[PDB]
Amino acid sequence: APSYHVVRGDIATATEGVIINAANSKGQPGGGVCGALYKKFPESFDLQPIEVGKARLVKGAAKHIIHAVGPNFNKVSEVEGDKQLAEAYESIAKIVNDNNYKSVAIPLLSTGIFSGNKDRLTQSLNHLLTALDTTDADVAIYCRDKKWEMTLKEAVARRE
């Protein structure tokens, strides 16, 4: 178990060695970041069909990226989204150790577009910490909004 760092930036600037993005069984990061990532790295636009629970890395000549399957809680029950959330985090956590990373840019999922309505970043964070507690690497979390760097700082402070 390491520390936690927050950076307000974008996926298309997440030069942390490694990036995780949503992909789902469609291969495509739901929302809009698909466009930024394409605009700077069309090589990560693999958008292959992926399995359900499995994360697959994508091998962009511009940069290596990681693509993860997030369940849509909006049309998946708590039982299946619990598993799929931990399956994503297992694929990620195993990959982190397999590749022996010290620090990784991991965004926060299930936070509007997959969740639909309820599950939040506080929760996905909790589970992301649980998976990454299993390493003594570090965890670097972004989002371009600023309220999240405040709240994540506040909780990172209360986490001492």
- Was 24 annotated as part of a binding site? yes
Range of the domain at 75: 1-160
Determine contact, residues 141/20, Cβ cutoff 8 Å. Answer: no
Tell which residue, 8, 156, 18, 11, has the closest CA to residue 96: 18
The one-letter amino acid at 96: V
How many domains, in total, are found in the chain?
Answer: 1
Q: Is 10 annotated as belonging to a binding site?
A: yes
Q: Alpha carbon of 149 to those of 10, 47, 109, 155: distances in Å? A: 13, 30, 15, 10
Q: Is 112 annotated for ligand binding?
A: yes
> Smallest Cα–Cα separation from 109: which of 42, 33, 13?
33
DSSP label at 106? -
Asked whether residue 35 is marked as a ligand-binding residue, the answer is no
Strand partners, 112: none
> Is 32 part of any known ligand binding site?
yes
- CB contact burial 10-44 (16+ within 10 A = b; e otherwise): ebbebebebbbbbbbeebbbbeebbeebeeebebb
CATH number at residue 159: 3.40.220.10
Residue 27 is assigned to a ligand binding site: no
